[PDB]
Ligand binder design. Structure first.
Ligand SMILES: [Mg+2]
Ligand SMILES: [Mg+2]
Ligand SMILES: [Mg+2]
Ligand SMILES: [Mg+2]
Ligand SMILES: [Mg+2]
Ligand SMILES: [Mg+2]
Ligand SMILES: [Mg+2]
Ligand SMILES: [Mg+2]
Ligand SMILES: [Mg+2]
Ligand SMILES: [Mg+2]
Ligand SMILES: [Mg+2]
Ligand SMILES: [Mg+2]
Ligand SMILES: [Mg+2]
Ligand SMILES: [Mg+2]
Ligand SMILES: [Mg+2]
Ligand SMILES: [Mg+2]
Ligand SMILES: [Mg+2]
Ligand SMILES: [Mg+2]
Ligand SMILES: [Mg+2]
Ligand SMILES: [Mg+2]
Ligand SMILES: [Mg+2]
Ligand SMILES: [Mg+2]
Ligand SMILES: [Mg+2]
Ligand SMILES: [Mg+2]
Ligand SMILES: [Mg+2]
Ligand SMILES: [Mg+2]
Ligand SMILES: [Mg+2]
Ligand SMILES: [Mg+2]
Ligand SMILES: [Mg+2]
Ligand SMILES: [Mg+2]
Ligand SMILES: [Mg+2]
Ligand SMILES: [Mg+2]
Ligand SMILES: [Mg+2]
Ligand SMILES: [Mg+2]
Ligand SMILES: [Mg+2]
Ligand SMILES: [Mg+2]
Ligand SMILES: [Mg+2]
Ligand SMILES: [Mg+2]
Ligand SMILES: [Mg+2]
Ligand SMILES: [Mg+2]
Ligand SMILES: [Mg+2]
Ligand SMILES: [Mg+2]
Ligand SMILES: [Mg+2]
Ligand SMILES: [Mg+2]
Ligand SMILES: [Mg+2]
Ligand SMILES: [Mg+2]
Ligand SMILES: [Mg+2]
Ligand SMILES: [Mg+2]
Ligand SMILES: [Mg+2]
Ligand SMILES: [Mg+2]
Ligand SMILES: [Mg+2]
Ligand SMILES: [Mg+2]
Ligand SMILES: [Mg+2]
Ligand SMILES: [Mg+2]
Ligand SMILES: [Mg+2]
Ligand SMILES: [Mg+2]
Ligand SMILES: [Mg+2]
Ligand SMILES: [Mg+2]
Ligand SMILES: [Mg+2]
Ligand SMILES: [Mg+2]
Ligand SMILES: [Mg+2]
Ligand SMILES: [Mg+2]
Ligand SMILES: [Mg+2]
Ligand SMILES: [Mg+2]
Ligand SMILES: [Mg+2]
Ligand SMILES: [Mg+2]
Ligand SMILES: [Mg+2]
Ligand SMILES: [Mg+2]
Ligand SMILES: [Mg+2]
Ligand SMILES: [Mg+2]
Ligand SMILES: [Mg+2]
Ligand SMILES: [Mg+2]
Ligand SMILES: [Mg+2]
Ligand SMILES: [Mg+2]
Ligand SMILES: [Mg+2]
Ligand SMILES: [Mg+2]
Ligand SMILES: [Mg+2]
Ligand SMILES: [Mg+2]
Ligand SMILES: [Mg+2]
Ligand SMILES: [Mg+2]
Lengths: 39, 94, 46
RNA sequence: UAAGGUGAUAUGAACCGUUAUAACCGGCGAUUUCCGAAUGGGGAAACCCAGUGUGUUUCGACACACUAUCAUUAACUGAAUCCAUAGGUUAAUGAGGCGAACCGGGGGAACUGAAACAUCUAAGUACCCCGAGGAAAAGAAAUCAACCGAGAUUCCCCCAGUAGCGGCGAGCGAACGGGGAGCAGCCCAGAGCCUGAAUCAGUGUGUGUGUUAGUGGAAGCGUCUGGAAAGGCGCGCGAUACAGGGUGACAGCCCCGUACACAAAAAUGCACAUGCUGUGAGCUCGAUGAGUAGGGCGGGACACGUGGUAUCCUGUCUGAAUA
RNA sequence: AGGACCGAACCGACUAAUGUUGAAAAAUUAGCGGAUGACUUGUGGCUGGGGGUGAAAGGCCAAUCAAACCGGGAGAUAGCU
RNA sequence: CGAAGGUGUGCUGUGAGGCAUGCUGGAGGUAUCAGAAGUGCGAAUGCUGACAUAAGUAACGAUAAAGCGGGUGAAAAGCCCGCUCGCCGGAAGACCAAGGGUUCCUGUCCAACGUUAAUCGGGGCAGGGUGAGUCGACCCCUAAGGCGAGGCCGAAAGGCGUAGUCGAUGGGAAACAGGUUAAUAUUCCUGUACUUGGUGUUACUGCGAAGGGGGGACGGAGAAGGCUAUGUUGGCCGGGCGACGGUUGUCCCGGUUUAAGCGUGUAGGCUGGUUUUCCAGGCAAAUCCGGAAAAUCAAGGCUGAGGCGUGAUGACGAGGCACUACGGUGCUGAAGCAACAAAUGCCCUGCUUCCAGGAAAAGCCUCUAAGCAUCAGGUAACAUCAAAUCGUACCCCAAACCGACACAGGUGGUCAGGUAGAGAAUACCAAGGCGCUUGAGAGAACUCGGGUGAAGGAACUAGGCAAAAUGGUGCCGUAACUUCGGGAGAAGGCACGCUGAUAUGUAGGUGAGGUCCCUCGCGGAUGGAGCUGAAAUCAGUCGAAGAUACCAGCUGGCUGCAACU
């Protein structure tokens, strides 16, 4: 899930730093996998 | 006598929750997010002055902050404090 | 088997902590070395 | 100084501002949680527990300040013990800690080399400790020289890998003298006479020069290729500016700049100048650094390893004369 | 009563087999010894490197010990490869 | 109008090389002659990265075990639901400390991590969640030990250490039951309590310490007795009348719970009380302690498990009654007794005994000193206020800790059901929790772990290695030797089940009703109901076998060494 860039609770909307669960972010996690793997 | 400026800097926000809605409708207890250095007497004075409502007792707990990973960078949220403020019977608050 | 690290925070801080380092002359030289190298965690102490 | 802004990843939201308290830059200020020399006591750093005093109180209690240690000074007090002294307490001033190198000092290696190794070397090196400053240290001849003379200290080039030292092995290695950089001399051990007289320090003021934001800053068009011209081909212009960088390919003339010309409300350095405060200047007559020099023993430093070994230092025992 | 007896917990580790790029940088399985004592265990503390400690094997001192580890002298030296 | 670089081709030189050009590429390159080098790599068990090989091989982590139906879903051996099966059950269950630090719960996703798939997850992402006067920490107190004003010592650094100050693993006030959340509860709610400080009134009036004394305050082993936890049975209440012969009964299943506190003061343990006088002691004092006397009374006091009553007309309670988003939510609610057995828990910090002779300090109680003198303070009641802060989720013998792993290892404390059993062994089960994150087949050699074995029975072998065997209780009986304790469980042997009788269940244990007495109660006799209940003898009877399973010594002889543990 996008982490919240910021969320207007006025009507419960707003923008969200789209960590999105970001398998892309977790793809950086997989890069970390290779890194600590190399370690 | 607790000073009004501190009493104005004590309270941060109300905490919305299913448990908070339960305590509000059953035990007549509101759940507040307060300042971290706030004590029970400062909270009771703030609700009794700033909300004009009769406080029976205040229960507090410290919430430990979670550890998050924004993208791939690790991070940790702040510890915050939560107060269960039991109002006396008959008192009502928005 | 019983391995060599059986943790205890009290013994960790009494043995390797900040005030134990700041107590003696040589321990103060340790903190001067870690500051010169630029360590983020200068000691054990959280 | 300004027409654009509310730091970044990083949009967006809600807003500010456009001739001047929008923003930005600089100067002086204000705030400056907690730990940390940490200094109220403690402590497993970022935590725990207080005391006194002055204020408030809607009596629930709040707020603020102070309280470390040591050195020095002063006051009061004050034992055994008469005075006394030790000791106690207050108060004031200061210190404390950190930090790259350089510097001075107190200690002080070994590997290695010697084709082994113990004297020696490595090396007074590495390292530890103490203390200081922007430099420190040293420093104004009980010095050299050679019968001529020089004239504090420090640094550089020579002298010279010389003279020497040395299991005379490995290796260590000057000085005199010469050329230069730079140059500066004074005071107390003491009275007087004239008395505040030089200089220095401090503090002001004033001027100049910087520094900490800044301002202006020249001069090119057309055409071809090409996604794009700064390129090619033409024709001009600037230059105390063809340093440099950027712009859709390589730009003196697009931009930022550069040469050059200026600029500071405020703070500050440095120069001068001078006020004030303190400081003494000069002349005469004197005086001329004693457990010291030197010596014995043991070590150390001098290039010099005790040698025929001068000189210097001193742990120990002694111990002069004194222009 | 007992450094008494048999025997679980607990402590230990005699034998065999497995395994030996293991399940495991010393273990499992079946048996084995002690088991009120010179017992065992938890927490905290003390002893520091030519030093500690040691019912003493040159044993142990963080999977490292006929002199720990780390950093430095240090690019030790190497007539040897 | 296409540089370097990359990739080809052609040509050329004796060689290191050189030139041209095609393609890619899309912006730099550089003649000549001189100059300077981090100037040319195939090796150094060279360094770094990438990719091979063995090889789609070994393995997929305890041989506790799975099968089916339905669901979801793109897809199901692994997820959810259900019915069966199996495993632990002194643990493979539950609660914690340490340690970890959000792993907790909910929604959602499946790339990666999960030794397979994955719709699942301790994985990713988002949200939510930890509530205390009584639990714990902090705090008061100190141990070992550390620091250490001054101080003593030391080239410096610094070492030791007084007053002190830290330091738990130990001492110090107080809360229980029930209910509830997706996730916290001795923390919330209901009920009922408790503690310590304050201030204030009122009565009363010796208060006072950095000092004195007491207390805290302490060992090992052993023996019983009293209890309780808990269990069993009976009774009671509710339900049932049986898929296959029988089962209205001497039948089956389930339930039969209740706290802190307050009052009583018991079993039982210790103890002589009381008054006055005096006193070289306790740094001074003392009314306190200690010590001398005298008098009087034998009977006062301290401690104390449990029980009983209350708490409790309550709560809980099998089940029902109803709605239902099938999760649930609401309402109602019977009986709720007795006997026996019984702890390693409690009385017990006790009693007895031994030698190896068994923390400190504060809190607490008391005494006075200076001081205060009618003020302060003291305790007594009542009222009122306060009790802060931090922790609290989750794992915790483990997939979350130490082991590089979701590792067959290691890890301190607490609870301790049933049947058999001496037992916390062991076997089967309960509560509760799991089936160990690859499966499906086949049923070769060989290996691993086991089962049985003709005849023989150590001939194997370095060697009876390993296996096999023995194994219990009771009784009989038991050698050399000896330090007189032993050896010795020597060796060796007999009995062992079930049923009936003795005795419709005995001896024994427990002990009611009832009655009597009393200085009256948690009393003392008597009394035996009821419950429980070995062991033995006799007769019979079954099987090949009665310590039938698990469990559970092989024995003896000679000798070396060391006394032994
Ligand atoms: Mg409450
Ligand atoms: Mg911004
Ligand atoms: Mg402090
Ligand atoms: Mg301190
Ligand atoms: Mg040597
Ligand atoms: Mg040498
Ligand atoms: Mg040599
Ligand atoms: Mg000087
Ligand atoms: Mg400009
Ligand atoms: Mg211009
Ligand atoms: Mg280009
Ligand atoms: Mg002189
Ligand atoms: Mg001399
Ligand atoms: Mg001499
Ligand atoms: Mg001499
Ligand atoms: Mg002398
Ligand atoms: Mg024994
Ligand atoms: Mg075993
Ligand atoms: Mg035994
Ligand atoms: Mg040996
Ligand atoms: Mg080791
Ligand atoms: Mg050593
Ligand atoms: Mg050595
Ligand atoms: Mg060297
Ligand atoms: Mg080398
Ligand atoms: Mg091309
Ligand atoms: Mg190039
Ligand atoms: Mg090319
Ligand atoms: Mg090319
Ligand atoms: Mg190569
Ligand atoms: Mg080669
Ligand atoms: Mg190679
Ligand atoms: Mg392959
Ligand atoms: Mg093969
Ligand atoms: Mg194969
Ligand atoms: Mg295979
Ligand atoms: Mg598995
Ligand atoms: Mg497996
Ligand atoms: Mg299925
Ligand atoms: Mg499976
Ligand atoms: Mg299932
Ligand atoms: Mg089973
Ligand atoms: Mg996480
Ligand atoms: Mg979960
Ligand atoms: Mg979820
Ligand atoms: Mg998939
Ligand atoms: Mg997978
Ligand atoms: Mg998760
Ligand atoms: Mg709390
Ligand atoms: Mg507590
Ligand atoms: Mg306390
Ligand atoms: Mg002590
Ligand atoms: Mg000390
Ligand atoms: Mg001192
Ligand atoms: Mg202390
Ligand atoms: Mg203390
Ligand atoms: Mg403790
Ligand atoms: Mg839970
Ligand atoms: Mg006392
Ligand atoms: Mg009972
Ligand atoms: Mg039937
Ligand atoms: Mg039938
Ligand atoms: Mg029944
Ligand atoms: Mg009761
Ligand atoms: Mg919990
Ligand atoms: Mg468990
Ligand atoms: Mg697994
Ligand atoms: Mg495991
Ligand atoms: Mg059991
Ligand atoms: Mg068992
Ligand atoms: Mg087979
Ligand atoms: Mg067999
Ligand atoms: Mg046979
Ligand atoms: Mg046979
Ligand atoms: Mg043979
Ligand atoms: Mg044979
Ligand atoms: Mg055998
Ligand atoms: Mg066997
Ligand atoms: Mg023999
Ligand atoms: Mg022996």
């Amino acid at each position: 899930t996008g982490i919240v860039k910021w969320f207007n609770a006025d009507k419960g909307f707003g923008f969200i730093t789209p960590d999105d669960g970001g398998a892309d972010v977790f793809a950086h996690f997989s890069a970390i996998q290779m890194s600590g793997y190399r370690a | 006598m607790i000073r009004e400026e501190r009493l104005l800097k004590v309270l941060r926000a109300p905490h919305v929750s299913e448990k908070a809605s339960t305590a509000m409708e059953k035990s007549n207890t509101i759940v507040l997010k307060v300042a971290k250095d706030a004590t029970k007497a400062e909270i009771k004075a703030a609700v009794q002055k700033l909300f004009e409502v009769e406080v029976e007792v205040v229960n507090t707990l410290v919430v430990k902050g979670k550890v998050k990973r924004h993208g791939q960078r690790i991070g940790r949220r702040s510890d915050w404090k939560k107060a269960y403020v039991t109002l006396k019977e008959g008192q009502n608050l928005d | 088997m019983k391995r060599t690290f059986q943790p205890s925070v009290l013994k960790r801080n009494r043995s390797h902590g900040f005030r134990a380092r700041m107590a003696t002359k040589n321990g103060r030289q340790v903190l001067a070395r870690r500051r010169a190298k630029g360590r983020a965690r200068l000691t054990v102490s959280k």
